[PDB]
Point group: C5
Chain length 124, copies 5
């Protein structure tokens, strides 16, 4: 399976966005975070962030930001791939999220979203 | 004829888009992939991808991504030029396809899209 | 708490924008500034600026400019994090402001904006 | 007069766009082409291209692409400045055009578009 | 006062735009120029331009171009800050003007625009 593509949430909408600058560990960083809803329902996995100079994948900051802004604007249905337990600074985690944003794919219907899905119920 | 312009599908619409970051073959990549429809017709050749650090043509990642995103927004008719059998990462190929996106042109009628047809 | 996130205003709207190039303190700079709406007044309050080559955070100039331009376009409610007493060029501070923009987050309701609170 | 500004078509609309990646003369290129209409009047001078690493002016690839995409979206009236007989790749010239795109200006009426005239 | 901010026109709209590539004084340049109106009337102070590799402030070419494009789209009321007597290529100044674009700020009423006044 595609490494780092095993945890996602499907058929959500990006309903909040944050962008900011922040000093961490002696490095000047940019970050953004997305907030999610599932139609009129609140979900448990509802926020995720990307940081330009930290994380498992530092590439693609601007392309990911522009993609997140696009879907916040359209309100379209998406699948968000994310990684747990990446941001470990507790004050950033409290303020924003611990999860790193990995990918954003579209859902053209209530039953199809683009991108890899887990093999089976146990992700063997 | 133009090398790598011999394989295309015309008058399709980009109806899905994926963008992500991913480690492939020991390298940090960005990729995007487009999903296609042709109205209500059943199509099998329906997904094409571009990767920033792999492929026959590594240039133009941002410009191709922004172009693909534009036509996803409009839903307009386009021609997709692509190359078969490029992606060798088995997990990536299974999730998307082996096809590399080469070019996107517009179609202004049922009978015309820009670019070569030979 | 997150350093530089202690001072903010919530559920505000950006009603004016400035972008320019300017020589300050012997350096060539770009800057932009946002003005915030107060009631029905035309004149903005609480202006905040970012400068490409000066400030506590020089990174993110283009992304912050594009974010500010976005919310000026939509008129949506946002929370703005900023730092007081940053710009020391007296002509610039008099013309625009002495505050430096740190972050912009959305407010999805009258009681919730993303980001940390005090 | 401004060199390379002597040949233009006025009050046209950009009604087609192409963007692709391509190996030409042994070098990796990006290119884009614009296709034109003139309302309902038949126009033969109807396609112009720009290439990132070839041409009389290599600068401004992304800005010219983004400008062309802008006018394709709006359908607004523009003047196109171009140079004939530029592209030496015969496969490219037959697929797209020989003409190099030099400038795009707007037209605010049927008689006025910005820029120099002959 | 802020150097280079003393000369401006207020409550204008950007009603034309030019973008092109051009060889000037032996250098390969990009430029753009803005055309203005003053509501229902013409204004004879016009055609302010920015050049990527010449001028008093060469930074911010892309951000100024994108900002100009934005106000051309919205038609919003703006103040333009500019510097007189900059461009010395006689063919360029005859086709456009000699004025270097310095800043664009918004106007929220018929009597207020952001930025300093004389
Ligand atoms: C996203 C992705 O699929 N990336 C994989 C890439 C791309 O498929 C490829 O670069 C596109 O052109 O392929 C990777 O594996 C290649 C690499 O191991 C080279 C090294 O020799 O071999 C390539 O296959 C060769 C083969 O070895 C030759 O003998 C002959 O058969 O031709 C083929 C041409 O493909 C591998 O594809 C890569 O690292 O480049 C792995 C990426 O994950
Ligand atoms: C370089 C320079 O002189 N800039 C001044 C400009 C120019 O003189 C003017 O734009 C050239 O046409 O004028 C500035 O003041 C004008 C501005 O406040 C506009 C706002 O709409 O009003 C102009 O007054 C109008 C007036 O309100 C009308 O009733 C009528 O009387 O005509 C005049 C002309 O339009 C003000 O002159 C400017 O900011 O544009 C001041 C600049 O310093
Ligand atoms: C677009 C344009 O007009 N470019 C001019 C350029 C600009 O006018 C100038 O750099 C902006 O400050 O001026 C050029 O020519 C001259 C210089 O060679 C010389 O150093 O000084 C001259 C004035 O006394 C004049 O500016 C230039 O910088 O090369 C010519 C160029 O086409
Ligand atoms: C736009 C502006 O005000 N720039 C001024 C900066 C900023 O105030 C600080 O860089 C903020 O951290 O301060 C200076 O003293 C400096 O650093 O040399 C002078 C300069 O003119």
């Amino acid at each position: 399976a595609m490494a780092d593509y095993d945890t996602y949430v499907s058929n959500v909408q990006i309903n909040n966005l944050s962008y900011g600058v922040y000093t961490s560990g002696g490095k000047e960083t940019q970050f953004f975070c997305i907030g999610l809803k599932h139609g009129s329902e609140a979900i448990s996995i509802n926020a995720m962030c990307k940081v330009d100079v930290y994380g498992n994948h530092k590439q693609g900051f601007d392309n990911m930001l522009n993609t997140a802004k696009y879907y916040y604007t359209t309100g379209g249905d998406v699948r968000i791939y994310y990684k747990e337990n990446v941001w470990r600074d507790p004050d950033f985690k409290s303020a924003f999220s611990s999860r790193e944003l990995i990918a954003i794919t579209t859902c053209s219907s209530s039953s199809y979203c683009m991108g890899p899905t887990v093999t089976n119920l146990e992700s063997d």
